[model samples]
Target: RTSIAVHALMGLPTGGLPKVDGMSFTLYRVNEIDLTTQAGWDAASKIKLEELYTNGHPTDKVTKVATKKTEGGVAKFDNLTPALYLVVQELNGAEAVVRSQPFLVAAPQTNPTGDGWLQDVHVYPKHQALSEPVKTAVDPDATQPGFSVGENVKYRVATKIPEIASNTKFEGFTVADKLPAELGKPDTNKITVTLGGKPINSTDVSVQTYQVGDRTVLSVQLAGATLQSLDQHKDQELVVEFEAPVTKQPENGQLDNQAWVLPSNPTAQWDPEESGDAALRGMPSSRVSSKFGQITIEKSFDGNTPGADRTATFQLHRCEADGSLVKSDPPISLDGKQEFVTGQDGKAVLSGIHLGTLQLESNVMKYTDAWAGKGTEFCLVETATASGYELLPKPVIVKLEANESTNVLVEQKVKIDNKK
Candidate 1:
């Protein structure tokens, strides 16, 4: 005779719940067994797990045995009457976002070796798991130099299709995003929703785009038959791709975007801002960021001269690895091929200039300076000088840098000096 307890090895969620160890499970002794035999195992297999939940447990034959909390994703129920046991997950007074389906196990069953009955019975429940939302920028050529104003910057948000219970209905799902000012509002037509590589029917999904202060807020919902059909494609990830034009320069030389997802439930609301707190009680929001900078020209004369033409014309160009200046192949939208001009005080500010170093990549420039040459750099050539003033001997070079710690733009300034 063996005296070991039955073991229920719980399956963890794919991305893991925040409070996994706190999850609890209860065991119910549904049917009494006289002894362990092949016939008894056969009878236990015939009992459908769906029936126990859908049609309600057979109260006449059921008896509350024990409740166990998961410790390291496992629970043990000892001191049994060698009966058919049913295991169900307990929420412990918390909201239920993810849950494992109930399952049955016959303790003291015939061992796999077929030698005799094994006392330490182990059973693994099929878990209904959900993954956290992940956001990313997918613009093909927008990484190194970064995206430009008025250009479309693409992005993607991904979440999983949870494996739901057989008896439970898929109420629906929601995905929401709070966009930064730089990433202008997303058009409904530019948004696409797909699951497992196939586009979800437009009728089953809806996108709500609205302005919340300076930020663009989005609320995308999926429901109806489309929601129910997700069961057929379990474990597949659902992706939402969209494109929004860059309306303005990035704040602090960086563009930040974040998104959140609501669990599959009818009563669950979609509020991206307050979702992180206990108000939503689901997965925390995901975030992603991209970098960008600008340039300012402070033109002046060596000596003060009244009535001297204070105006100056300058052309912006990209720098080569050898420190040579080259015209931008596909000119940046800032000012095309036109030369930049300054006013009375000889001050001109240019916005939306990508970041990089304007020095040669050779050893001398790299080791001597505290700041390393990286990203994108430019050359400012003073083409036209004031009437009576001589032109600059060479172009003024400037490097762009970003300060993430202080979240401030590393604006580069070039001071041009001309003699009379």
Candidate 2:
């Protein structure tokens, strides 16, 4: 018999400050008994706020049973049945992102959010899980490959592996790493770890890589421990490090490496790859993390009367599927600061944009919202004698998917024309 309550501040739009009003909330519950394995826990974490707001949870195990709105940075859920409760928040004009961490409303005892603040979720972009026992922080920000040829880089993973009296008991322990072909393989035999400054012996761990599709999968295993043994019980600071060479260059100069750790495999089939469950897999983060991409924006005054493709100031913005401006990831500046002004060539190149819907809002002419992805080339509309580029008439929204063709770097300019 168990029940509990949860409270939180529903954050404003990515860049919206002063905690704007109208942020919506929805809470769903998943059975604790069903979440016994890693995949189960991963499936439980699958409750994305943006998605939940759209389709709604529709499974027998996951029930979208509660709703509320945020006020003054706070919202509360009372009298929840003992289950894993996932929380999500959405705003009408903002990308609807959900909290990465789910709250445990187990009736036996109320639990506080961990690691400094009583808040469960960590800093944005990477929703590193914040819970009990061995807390894991995957810092991909630490000295990564520039994604350029001839650059050798190292990725560092930090973990607090605890012994005895721990909830994350292990049947197998290893790091499952995936890297793009351009970034060759890491020195697997050199998967090194240091405790303060001493090298951990081969008796304790092992690291290696293997082929998987077009990618190379690297594994760092705890080989010394006995089969299915919970060897590391006491808290110890372990820094595991490995290096990789930029063997080649990706078409978009994007060499991505998504990694996660497996403290233990489930008692039964823990088929992590294909929709088994996200959390069950295990590192820097689960699979959802995406590599940042770049593109070039060009504005041309094609109609002869517009005086030969003159320079035009257009404020460009990347929007979500529902057409809300993406305010995070290099954060969009609502002011003129983030706007792009066409020069002699009538083009501007933008970098580090997360994949999503995009558009030009301000005083641009004949524009419509479009989606942006890896190698997309968006050619916006300004058809049929646009009147001196006034507020756009909202034409047939044509969204060109990013083309990641060989050696493509926004290869061809994405053009938008203003006709007179």
Candidate 3:
């Protein structure tokens, strides 16, 4: 009989404080067959041509064959025919028990036909911490305070689980905390719970106060004036406004001390300032003497068949520091290539493929004019134009039977504020 070895990881708990002991190990196994029976025949003499024309002849009958039981879960037999066998384990009643899945056994150059050629059956025991004492924590004491109407309050409590013996089984659990109703509060706090029960830990207990009233009143601060006398401004628009005067830097240039005027509506002139205004028209804009920004685009592909020769292309567009589109150049493009191959499971597999981000643009802008303050905006556009023949959705799940690929496009607009 072939011998097999097995090992198990055991869990144990430390002292009264909740802790774990990562120690102790054991190995065991159950052999294939035991206490079974078979049938065969023993030869006595050679037959002579059907006993010479039907003359009566004595013959040996089939007899039962009792196989020997091996000690220590082991066994051996004479002329053991090659066949499939199983291994099992037998445990003592006092030790912990475990059941295992069956495995196949066969000899070289032997293919046994039919079922039930060998049987394996056994029960095993597992060890237990008989001397360890199970620890229990009584329920916690809780309290709540009453508040004057329209006032807010909060409370919190905490506790810890006592560590116990390792490998100790927790069988019983209880809790005993309670709050008084005289506190004019709801029973929101759960005082009792089991280790594996609801309210997993002591930190979970919390309380919050709300404004008390018949109509569920709420308390909040009013930043502006109250409507003490609405009749005083019955015909007014109830408008609020503010104004500030400022001197331009250098205090001498034609536009230095002048108020910058935004075109009531700038034609798509595409000039730096005019286009910047158009770009900033709807978006908040900012101006500065120097501006720097970076755009990075990443592309990847799954090299799987059915779409092996797949390619991905990324298009990027840049707008002026203002919101206007810079027509100076068309969208920049980045491309990636991937290959597909067949997998062992008759499925397409992505073999070789280039996957990484391609830097689109990296530079700093130097402005001839003074930095524009607040209300400047810049836009970056990313578009996916071409994709490999394989159309797969991300996150791609590559299976042995099928090849998959994916493409994605994203864009973002950033607002620059000189105030920063």
Which one wins on lDDT? 1
Q: Which lDDT tens digits does candidate 3 get at residues 345-385?
A: 22321111111111111122222211122112223232222
Per-residue lDDT of candidate 2, residues 106-147 (tens digit): 233323543242223211211112112121212222222122
By lDDT, the better pick of 1 and 3 is: 1
Order of models, best lDDT first = 1, 2, 3
Candidate 2 lowest-lDDT run of ten: 122-131
Task: Quantify all predictions' global Cα lDDT against the true fold.
Answer: 0.60, 0.42, 0.21
Off by over 4 Å in 2: 1-147, 162-169, 195-197, 225-235, 265-274, 277-280, 283-420
Give the higher-TM-score candidate: 1 or 3: 1
TM-score of 2: 0.34
Cα deviation of 263, candidate 3, in Å? 80
Tens digits of per-residue lDDT for model 1, 35-149:
3577766666676665555432335555667766656545667666676777766433123345555667666678998998877776655444456666666553542334555
For candidate 3, what's the RMSD?
Answer: 35.8
Measured against the true structure, the TM-scores of the candidates, in listed sequence, are 0.62, 0.34, 0.14
Runs of candidate 1 with Cα error greater than 4 angstroms are 1-129, 140-145, 166-169, 265-269, 275-278, 281-286, 303-308, 327-330, 335-339, 354-376, 402-406
